[PDB]
Enzyme design. Structure first.
Site, PDB file in Angstrom:
ATOM      1  N   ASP A   9      24.699  25.818 -10.278  1.00  0.00           N
ATOM      2  CA  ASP A   9      26.053  25.275 -10.384  1.00  0.00           C
ATOM      3  C   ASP A   9      26.916  26.317 -11.091  1.00  0.00           C
ATOM      4  O   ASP A   9      26.804  26.498 -12.308  1.00  0.00           O
ATOM      5  CB  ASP A   9      26.047  23.945 -11.142  1.00  0.00           C
ATOM      6  CG  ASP A   9      27.392  23.214 -11.093  1.00  0.00           C
ATOM      7  OD1 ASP A   9      28.419  23.795 -10.666  1.00  0.00           O
ATOM      8  OD2 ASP A   9      27.414  22.050 -11.556  1.00  0.00           O
ATOM      9  N   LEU A  10      27.790  26.976 -10.334  1.00  0.00           N
ATOM     10  CA  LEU A  10      28.584  28.062 -10.891  1.00  0.00           C
ATOM     11  C   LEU A  10      29.662  27.515 -11.816  1.00  0.00           C
ATOM     12  O   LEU A  10      30.322  26.522 -11.510  1.00  0.00           O
ATOM     13  CB  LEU A  10      29.221  28.909  -9.781  1.00  0.00           C
ATOM     14  CG  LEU A  10      28.281  29.742  -8.904  1.00  0.00           C
ATOM     15  CD1 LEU A  10      28.973  31.055  -8.522  1.00  0.00           C
ATOM     16  CD2 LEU A  10      26.986  29.950  -9.612  1.00  0.00           C
ATOM     17  N   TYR A  14      36.320  29.320  -8.826  1.00  0.00           N
ATOM     18  CA  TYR A  14      37.545  30.021  -8.432  1.00  0.00           C
ATOM     19  C   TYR A  14      38.046  30.902  -9.571  1.00  0.00           C
ATOM     20  O   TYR A  14      38.481  32.039  -9.347  1.00  0.00           O
ATOM     21  CB  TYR A  14      38.658  29.058  -8.006  1.00  0.00           C
ATOM     22  CG  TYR A  14      38.381  28.242  -6.758  1.00  0.00           C
ATOM     23  CD1 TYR A  14      37.218  28.426  -6.007  1.00  0.00           C
ATOM     24  CD2 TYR A  14      39.275  27.257  -6.352  1.00  0.00           C
ATOM     25  CE1 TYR A  14      36.968  27.654  -4.874  1.00  0.00           C
ATOM     26  CE2 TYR A  14      39.046  26.499  -5.224  1.00  0.00           C
ATOM     27  CZ  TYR A  14      37.905  26.693  -4.485  1.00  0.00           C
ATOM     28  OH  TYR A  14      37.735  25.886  -3.379  1.00  0.00           O
ATOM     29  N   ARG A  46      39.984  25.457 -20.745  1.00  0.00           N
ATOM     30  CA  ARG A  46      39.352  24.172 -21.020  1.00  0.00           C
ATOM     31  C   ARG A  46      39.309  23.877 -22.519  1.00  0.00           C
ATOM     32  O   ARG A  46      39.325  22.701 -22.922  1.00  0.00           O
ATOM     33  CB  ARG A  46      37.972  24.121 -20.420  1.00  0.00           C
ATOM     34  CG  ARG A  46      37.797  22.941 -19.593  1.00  0.00           C
ATOM     35  CD  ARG A  46      36.347  23.035 -19.205  1.00  0.00           C
ATOM     36  NE  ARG A  46      35.977  24.306 -18.585  1.00  0.00           N
ATOM     37  CZ  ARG A  46      36.483  24.775 -17.452  1.00  0.00           C
ATOM     38  NH1 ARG A  46      37.315  24.057 -16.711  1.00  0.00           N
ATOM     39  NH2 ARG A  46      36.174  26.010 -17.070  1.00  0.00           N
ATOM     40  N   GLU A 102      27.857  25.076  -5.485  1.00  0.00           N
ATOM     41  CA  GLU A 102      26.565  24.495  -5.832  1.00  0.00           C
ATOM     42  C   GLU A 102      25.555  24.774  -4.729  1.00  0.00           C
ATOM     43  O   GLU A 102      25.880  24.731  -3.532  1.00  0.00           O
ATOM     44  CB  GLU A 102      26.673  22.994  -6.094  1.00  0.00           C
ATOM     45  CG  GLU A 102      27.378  22.607  -7.379  1.00  0.00           C
ATOM     46  CD  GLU A 102      27.569  21.116  -7.496  1.00  0.00           C
ATOM     47  OE1 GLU A 102      26.677  20.287  -7.152  1.00  0.00           O
ATOM     48  OE2 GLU A 102      28.665  20.790  -7.947  1.00  0.00           O
TER      49      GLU A 102
END
Lengths: 367, 367
Positions: A9-10, A14, A46, A102
DNA sequence: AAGGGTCCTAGGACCCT
DNA sequence: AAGGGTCCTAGGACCCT
C-alpha cells in the site's frame, strides 16, 4: 490450504510522484488537486490538517501555505503504478492490483521454497521484519508463525526494492488472506509493515469502528446495515444469517458476514493488462450543445495514444454522460476496419451521444 | 483474406436420432414432440404436410397415422450433437456450433495445404463435389473457384464420415463466409451439398423473400424494418444508413445492412465446451405453491449429473421463472465449498425463488 | 465540474430444434 | 405448459486516489 498473502500500500501515491518530479515540493505541505478536490496530500500536509478528498477551500483554510499541483491527468501516476506491479510480479507472478497504489501478492509458494532451503538450525533463527500486530508473541514452533515471518521478510525485500528501484515508499501487511493483509498493512502507516499472526485476527477485525471499514462493505451496504441496527463488526457477526440473506441477497450477505469474521478465501488474481481504458472530463454544466464533440475529440486523442502503445486492440467503445440533477452510457462494437482513425471514431461516438456536467469515453472488450 | 467456410446442417436431427434408436420408425412418418409441439419430423412426415413447430393437434389432423415420440429430454440429441462437432474438429479444429445440429468450419488453411500438394497437371482436374449454386459455370483458372471446389471436396468427406461413423445424414454449404455458407447449405436440402461461387452471391441473397430469412435479423429487427417499409433484401440494401443507425443502433444497423449484401467478416469461433448447462420445465400454470421445490430438485438432479461428467465446475447458478401473462431470473455465485451437495443447492435456489408456467435452472460461469 | 478501476446482474437480441 | 444455446448492454455494487 494455508496462505501467506502480502498487501502493498503506497503512501500518498500521487503526492510521492509529484514530489519526485519536483523535489522542490518535499518538505513543503503538498496537495494534489482534481477540480475542487484535494485528492491526496504528502505527510507534512496531513500533519497540518489536510485530509483525503477535502475541498480545496477547506484545505487552504486549514493550511494557506499548502502547495497544490494539478492531478487531473493520471498518466504519470498510472505509469508508475504499473512499474510497481511489474516489480512485484518479479517476486511472484500472481499480483492483484486494487486501484493504482495497492497490490496483493500470494507469497505462499515462495515462502514454502524458502523454508525448504533452511536447516533445522537457522529455522530456530527466523525473525520478523517490521511490526507484529498487537505486539503478539511469536511461537517459533508454530509452523504458521514461521511461514508468516518469512512472508514478512519477503515483504521487506519488496518494499526495499520498491524504494531502491523506483524511489517509492509504502506499507505492507502480511496475513493469511487478502482481507486481513489489507486491514493490517495500515496499522503502522507511514512506510512500515505489520504481520498478523492468527491469534490476533479477532483483535484486528474488532479494532474497526464502522462496518464500512471492511473492504467489500460500501456506501449502499453499510447504509442498509445501519438501517437494520447493524453497526459494529460484532453486530454483523451475530446478526441473523436468514434476515441478512433476505435483505441483501444470498451473495452479499454470505460474503460480508464471512468478512465480518475475518474470513476471505478469494484467491489473489493475476490482474495482468488492464481490461479497459477510459478518460473523464467534468465541468460545471459547461456543455449544453452538440459542440460537445470537441471534448469528445479531446478524450479520444489521448485514449487512442494509450491504446496504441498498449498493443491489444479494443473491440468496444462506450460513451458516458452525467446530467444536472447516476450516470448514463451507450456502447457499441468497434467496426473491424477501424480496429486496424480519429474521424470514424467520433461520428460513432456522436451517434451514441445523440441517442442520449461530465463526458467520458471508454475502450473495453480488448483482444 | 479470402476464406473457405463450410456450414454443416443435419437433416431433421431429433428425428434422425429417434429413427436410429428405434428403426421401427423409419419408413413411417415421425414427429418428435415437446408438449403440444411437433418440433421436428422425419421427411416422410414432411411429405404428408407436417411442418416444424406445428401443433400436435394440427399435425395429427394433416396426418393421423403420424407416430409421435417424446423429445422433452435432449440428452441423446445433445450427446450426438457433440459427437458431430468432435468429428468435424478432427478435420480442422476451429468449429463453431450453432444450436445442436449446425456447425461452421473454417476450411481455409486446409484448402490451402491441399492445393500446395497438387501438381499443375491435376490442378486442371479439380472437380466439384455436389451442387454448384445457380448452375454457375466453373472457371478452373479462377483461384477462388479452385479453392471453393476443394472446400466442396472436404465438405463431402465430412458428410461421408458423419454417415459412416455416426449414421447421420446432413447438408453442407461451402462459401467464402459464414452467412453465405449457411444460406447455400439449404438450397438442395435432403442430405446434399452446394457450393457458392462468388459471381452468384447476389443471386443468393436476392433469392430470399423475407428479411427475417437473413441469419441475424430476428423477430424484433424484422418487425422494426417492416415498420419502416423495408421488406425485401434489396430494400435493406438501398435504405438510408443514417436512418437505419438512428432507429436500431449503430451496431444493429451497420451489421444487418452488411448482411443484406452478403458480407460477413465474423470469424468462425471455436465453440469448445459449453458455456452453460440448463434445464427447463413448463406446465399449464401447474405451479402455485412453494412446493414447486420438487420441480427444482428434479432439474437439479439431472443438471448435477451433467456438470459432474463435464469436469469443469460452475461458479454461478440462476433460477428462471415464467408467470401467467418475458421471463424473470435471479442468479448468485456458488459457494466455494459447494463447488467441491443437493441440499445446499436447493435452499440457495429457493431463496432465489422467494426473492421473485415455467421453472428453469442454469449453471454458468464455468471454470 | 475527481478520475480512474473491477466484476456482477437481469434482461434482451439472436441461433437452432 | 418447447427446450435448449450464444453474446451484448446499461447499470449498479465495490476498490483506490
Amino acid at each position: 490450504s494455508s496462505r501467506v498473502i502480502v498487501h502493498v500500500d503506497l503512501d500518498c501515491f500521487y503526492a510521492q510522484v509529484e514530489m519526485i518530479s519536483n523535489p522542490e515540493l518535499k518538505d513543503k505541505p503538498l496537495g494534489v488537486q482534481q477540480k475542487y478536490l484535494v485528492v491526496t496530500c504528502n505527510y507534512e500536509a496531513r500533519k497540518l490538517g489536510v485530509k483525503k478528498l477535502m475541498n480545496v477551500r477547506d484545505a487552504k483554510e486549514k493550511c494557506p501555505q499548502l502547495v497544490l499541483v494539478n492531478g487531473e491527468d493520471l498518466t504519470r501516476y498510472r505509469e508508475m503504478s504499473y512499474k510497481v506491479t511489474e516489480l512485484l510480479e518479479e517476486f511472484s507472478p500472481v499480483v492483484e492490483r486494487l486501484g493504482f497504489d495497492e497490490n496483493f501478492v500470494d507469497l505462499t509458494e515462495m515462502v514454502e521454497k524458502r523454508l525448504q532451503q533452511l536447516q533445522s538450525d537457522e529455522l530456530s533463527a527466523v525473525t520478523v521484519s517490521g511490526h507484529v500486530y498487537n505486539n503478539q508473541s511469536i511461537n517459533l514452533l508454530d509452523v504458521l508463525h514461521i511461514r508468516l515471518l518469512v512472508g514478512s521478510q519477503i515483504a521487506a525485500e519488496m518494499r526495499e526494492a520498491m524504494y531502491n528501484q523506483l524511489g517509492l515508499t509504502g506499507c505492507a501487511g502480511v496475513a493469511s488472506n487478502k482481507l486481513l493483509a489489507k486491514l493490517v498493512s495500515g496499522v503502522f502507516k507511514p512506510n512500515q509493515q505489520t504481520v498478523l499472526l492468527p491469534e490476533s485476527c479477532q483483535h484486528l477485525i474488532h479494532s474497526l469502528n464502522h462496518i464500512k471499514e471492511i473492504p467489500g462493505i460500501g456506501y449502499k451496504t453499510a447504509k442498509c446495515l445501519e438501517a437494520l441496527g447493524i453497526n459494529s463488526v460484532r453486530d454483523l457477526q451475530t446478526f441473523s444469517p436468514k434476515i441478512l440473506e433476505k435483505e441483501l441477497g444470498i451473495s452479499v450477505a454470505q460474503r460480508i458476514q464471512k468478512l465480518s469474521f475475518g474470513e476471505d478465501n478469494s484467491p489473489v488474481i493475476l490482474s495482468g493488462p488492464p481490461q479497459s481504458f477510459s478518460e473523464e472530463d467534468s465541468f460545471k454544466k459547461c456543455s449544453s450543445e452538440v459542440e460537445a464533440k470537441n471534448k469528445i475529440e479531446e478524450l479520444l486523442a489521448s485514449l487512442l495514444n494509450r491504446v496504441c502503445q498498449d498493443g491489444r486492440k479494443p473491440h468496444t467503445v462506450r460513451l458516458i454522460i452525467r446530467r444536472y440533477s447516476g450516470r448514463e452510457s451507450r456502447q457499441c462494437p468497434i467496426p473491424s476496419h477501424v480496429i486496424q482513425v480519429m474521424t470514424p471514431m467520433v461520428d460513432i461516438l456522436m451517434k451514441l451521444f445523440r441517442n442520449m456536467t461530465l463526458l467520458s469515453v471508454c475502450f473495453c472488450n480488448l483482444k
